[model samples]
Target chain A: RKEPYLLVFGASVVDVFGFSKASYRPYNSTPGHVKISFGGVCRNIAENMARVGVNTNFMSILGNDEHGKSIVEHSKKIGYHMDDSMVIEGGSTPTYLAILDENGEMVSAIADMKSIGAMNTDFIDSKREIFENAEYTVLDSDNPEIMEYLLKNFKDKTNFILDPVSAEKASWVKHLIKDFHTIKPNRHEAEILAGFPITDTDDLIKASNYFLGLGIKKVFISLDADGIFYNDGVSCGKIKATEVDVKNVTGAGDSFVAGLGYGYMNKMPIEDIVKFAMTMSNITISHEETIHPDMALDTVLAKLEKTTWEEEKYDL
Target chain B: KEPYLLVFGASVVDVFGFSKASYRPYNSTPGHVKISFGGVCRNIAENMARVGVNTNFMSILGNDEHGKSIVEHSKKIGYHMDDSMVIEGGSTPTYLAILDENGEMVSAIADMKSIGAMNTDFIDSKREIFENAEYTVLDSDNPEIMEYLLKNFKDKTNFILDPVSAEKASWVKHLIKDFHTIKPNRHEAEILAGFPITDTDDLIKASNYFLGLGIKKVFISLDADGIFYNDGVSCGKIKATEVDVKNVTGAGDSFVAGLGYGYMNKMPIEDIVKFAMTMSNITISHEEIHPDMALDTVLAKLEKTTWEEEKYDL
Candidate 1:
């Protein structure tokens, strides 16, 4: 149909959340509700983008599993073109088991992500056309080898937004940082990617410059409740988000990455890009699930109108 | 890929006959006959496979309709038919049981002759799968293969023996000393222990009898009074979770599978007991391996269960 605007590559996880009614021990039985949902850095971003009516396609490996089948179908239902995702026969569906105590605080979690390895270089070659034609390609550094391969081979083909999945994985992408067009790293990840420690606004500006100096087109550093620091070489600034009672706060960053694709493709100014990203996250943490099920372009547009955004474009 | 657990036994397609109305002997009295996939090894392997354990089931079936049917259904249940064999021109094992209107078995015949296809040669063919396993569970349905598996590979991999029934328990009497764990109900325990468990005191004597024979852990299924367990030093009885249990036929199989899940991970004894009983409780309620009923889910439900510690003097 329409040319694919955004391509997301990474893992799609089945989140198995366990809630115990009382204090619990490992392998001990506790009365509680178990909730299952779909999540993963790139998976959430792609679903969020598609839910807002952006034409997006997902590239990941899904096992021929119960959770895997539902994951593919749900993304397709949310307007994601999932034909690019590979399926391994008997491959374990990437599952994250999170146990929470009665206070709702987390106990421990185990992640089985061995299935996502099916997306090797050969898998990338099979879907070269989508990468070559996409306007914005979003991904996470879940697999270092896959991340390096895409950066080395497809850097010139499309706009790349690197979501450093975790601080542990951010270190893996630091050596190949020059090719990423845009990167959204949280406060801790920003420090690792920037090769320096950051504690204040000026340090964030310095960190953004580290990426811009290396040819990165845009860098957005997320500060948990403090808002975001954004730089595009021409202009850079921090926008403060209005407060809202936070809930799960799981997919805010993922939704922020999707917001970047949304605002940039519509040619919004730097102020609107960070504002759109910020407002979307505000919507994210206000919901229990990762990536609010009700998010849409109209809802985001409507919410940001009444929301106060304090912005100060920094001058070097 | 090396599997953490290996299972050797029978996979069957069951044929059930039900009578709609009462009172008749052999005058073509029939209302409905249904066929479905079943067998102790099939149930155990299926349960273990769903709980995130990499399991290999070295079983035998025939190249028949029921055989193809069982394999196809199992493939959909997140496990494979690898290492399992299909015997051409042989019948896939089927259990023919007729239940009365009162929900009691009146007559039954088990047709598991095809398990003879899983001879010593077939066991040797999948030797690597057996050797690499962390634990191997043997079904007493086929004594030749059971003895062969224990004698040839017991040193390489730990064994968990499910003596299927009191009749089958006699088949593995000599091999009990080599098992890491053995699940035998009161009846089977009498045969294995060479003494009838007349009361609570008899449970300790029978269980200690098994433990003294070099079995590391012994679980004596006490039915409604819950299960008694001994690790040769300490012993206790656990109460079952209170739920509207639909059936207990598959409960023991699911419990044995749960033990494989816990022990292979080197879980604490208290945790393992709670986990296994919780798994059997869930299996008794609405069965065929629910996805939400995984390891943590099973453990989480254990809070609803009760048990008495130090139930006996070791």
Candidate 2:
């Protein structure tokens, strides 16, 4: 087929990390032990989409450093297109630092994405062909300029799948909502972009409506432990958070996006999309790894059978 | 006065730490937190220097990118240089991937000197300088090139201290008993040596025996239980100051350096070394693992304690 059903755009990070014992502060540590590997949300979603057995292609920028080179090669090994991925020469690679304690909890961290931040618009316009035939374009709002430009030009051409990255960044994308077919905001993010604090469901619905009023067909919001919601104009539905032992919350949101994207690309129904999203998100938070291709399909179906969607009484 | 001691070796840099938890194997973990900083013997020495102590400086090579920066920054910060540091550009320094849970060690991953090999000739050639080193020297076998060093230099120098990084390396000069004085951290020293050190009396008895090994003096460290020291010929000893500690990073190294400084300044073993030991006790109580300036605050506090060694058990 002409490329894939969906095209994803973002920066791929070559993440290296060590998992240490739980000590109060970094300086107070008599470090017990550690573990490390490569990761990033962009790479994570691409890998998740592949596991769902979806025809997905990703267009993103990567530094030509050894770490980036390895990532590019690894993506190919996993069957993503090498031509669509950009590797910047003589450019700095992006990296983040975080602390996860014994409870598999995040304490504090520092991050720098000099390379991801430096992604120029030079290669973006030329890569438009890659997205032209795609049914949907999933975008991470880490790069505001590129996201703004793409939304402005491609609004009528494709369905924009959005994860606004963080609350502060979400503010910038408020103007582009009418162009977005779907918007997924985490609990805290929903409170910020909606110009109101989200204390409960009543607050959440109000926030989603703010985006829906701007022309978005569906608004999905993620709340930890408590499932997710989608006010798709005609019917607003909510999925209860699956009772899975939450080990880590690192990439739970990305996994949810992958699930929703898979369902819609397959032309699955609304109720099915919500169920699939909840199940996939549930599975990721339960396991240490981001996406388990072997377990994803079965996990989703099993969770869907167990989950029940309750309609919000006060919705439009 | 010289600002403080600068002992250079390993500084820890960690990440994806499962903080406030216990150790688990990689496959068993769902995800881990990430952090980074200095590690090992080198970090110990630098932290001491940071707090205004004086000590001999040593290291054989810098193999990782970070290790190189560590060596360069440490030298600039004023740690005594023995010229045994990296001779050429390569990797920085040695590093370990540690998995820690609330103040306990779990599993660790190590990637060191995949850059350049270590060399100990500088230490070997500098034996005369080591003898002239008026301040005591704290040594650990954590670095690659020190085995050859202990073999040749044990007997010739005074004021020796060892942290158990490698038992094999320590054995190279162990048979000869080279320390004029020595100290070992609880786990490595007790485990590899098989000394009965469960209680204070056992610790004191062990310190006396280490002194009896024809070594001029010995100090057996009991983590958190405090430290015990014997001057070889004497049946009596001193129990170091006790204080709630923050990080265990430089506690032992600071104790060793404090002991040496007390001994060299010719202060009474009871008064001078008491202050020295307390200085170390306080160093580990800070968050930096080795806050350089904090050591002096302990020295200042030692001035307030009325000097006395109560009748204590050996």
Candidate 3:
């Protein structure tokens, strides 16, 4: 329905993780099962967008080894147009190993993603054809070279949507806010971006406005179950989340990005767009699955019924 | 001719190793080669027999997956005629290995055949037919099941030949020495039998003493130069300076089997066994050929050289 294609460029990993319900060091004799799934900010977003019936193109370098080949196969099975992906020779695909708890939240993680962090930026500059024509380009901050280059060249050309994977990485993109149209940063990311110790609503508003004033068209700050905040030039607002049965929260932000990008791509109003994003995020936390949209329509309705907004006035 | 067959038992590996001229760490630009070949004693012997030779079955586990299939293909190509080799479920054989500048080896190895190692004791008890034949078994001490079988069958019937590694040979000699022939090189022979071997005189004396203990034969080899042989009575020595040395691995066992073949075929002791064993010596000189040279050729070479004899004082 548009001239601009949605392009996702960055890292993807096959994650093998375990979450123990019991509290014991190492061998907790608790009921915990291992899970292997597709991960990476760009990869997850690409899959989420494809699940929402959007045509997505992914560009990155993966080792031509077994893991890399499997990641490619996984991308193909989920219908990602992978013409721009280059398979590097003689190395393993990046992988993540982690441990979580019964609440389906990450307690700690050990990541091995040399191959992901080793994405070829030399070829990235050559892929301007895919980026320049795209209405939205989602970049994970994991690839610093790509982040630096895109901010240096194409950020003004494309609608840059940034998802800083962690608080440390989030700070790297905060200075690029003037070039980025929208950025998805969680509470920790927002705190890091604003360089403040956030403990309450006042801290959250002050931190979020720090980005909006930096010339970012909109800053969507996700705060777990407390819901989300929106800071744009016309309106500074917040949406309180409905209490849904929280099962998992892994792909919740990515699902929000997908919904928000959908609304933004369709040019929906500010309030309608924020509410749409909230519903999609709540459905994700309510379900055991990584990314779920069947409950999207229902979540949107419930969110509209349950959420309230306030004009966030920052004492700056 | 002896009314029996020879079945050599040892582990075979599809060795994947990198050849390096110098030392380098992992994931570095060390060398540009990856090799896959038969790396176990039983596997090599089976291949040796498969090349239109006289030998029979038995090596323990299958190296499962595609490697298993490759082993099976090599087994068929070598014309190995027995189903004694069992393929246990859920086991694979792979090793991450490298060879250094001095041709020494270090491997990041795992025997994927864990269950095979755990449950391979079942096949050792099948000694019904084995009790009657001369099994030239390789006595590698790594496999506990193989050692158990060697202990069970050595004194029961025919002969047991130990083609053991250097370190393992000492331990094996202590546990199982009633064997008909012990195929030890000069170094391992010295270590296991606890005798100082420095020159030709000492090697001949050692061989005579080994045969004096009621063992049928002692084939003491000094790699590359030649081998010294004493067949229990008189010392008849012969050596072949390999004219074209290619790859010297597995030459000792090949020489031992050359003697086994010579003895089994009733080759005359008066003539000289080195002419018969020159086939093995010549085979070890070529890469991947595994010394399949002919006895007729060995005899023709034997027709040219005069035999060296030492008068025994015993």
DockQ of 3: 0.03
Of all true interface contacts, what fraction is found in model 2? 0.02
**What lDDT does the true structure give each of the candidates?**
0.77, 0.60, 0.61
Clashes of each: 4, 66, 2
Please give the lDDT score at residue B47 for candidate 2: 45
Name the runs in model 1 displaced over 4 angstroms: A22-30, A98-110, B1-314
**Residues A203-233, candidate 1, lDDT per residue (tens digit)?**
9988899889999999998888888888999
Candidate 3 structure quality by residue, lDDT tens digits, B173-269: 5544556766677788787667789887788777777776667766666665456666666664555443557676665555555555555567665
Error of 3 at B129 (Å): 35
Candidate 1 local lDDT, residue A294: 84
- Ranking 1 against 2 by lDDT, winner: 1
Candidates by lDDT, descending order: 1, 3, 2
Give lDDT: candidate 1, residue A4: 49
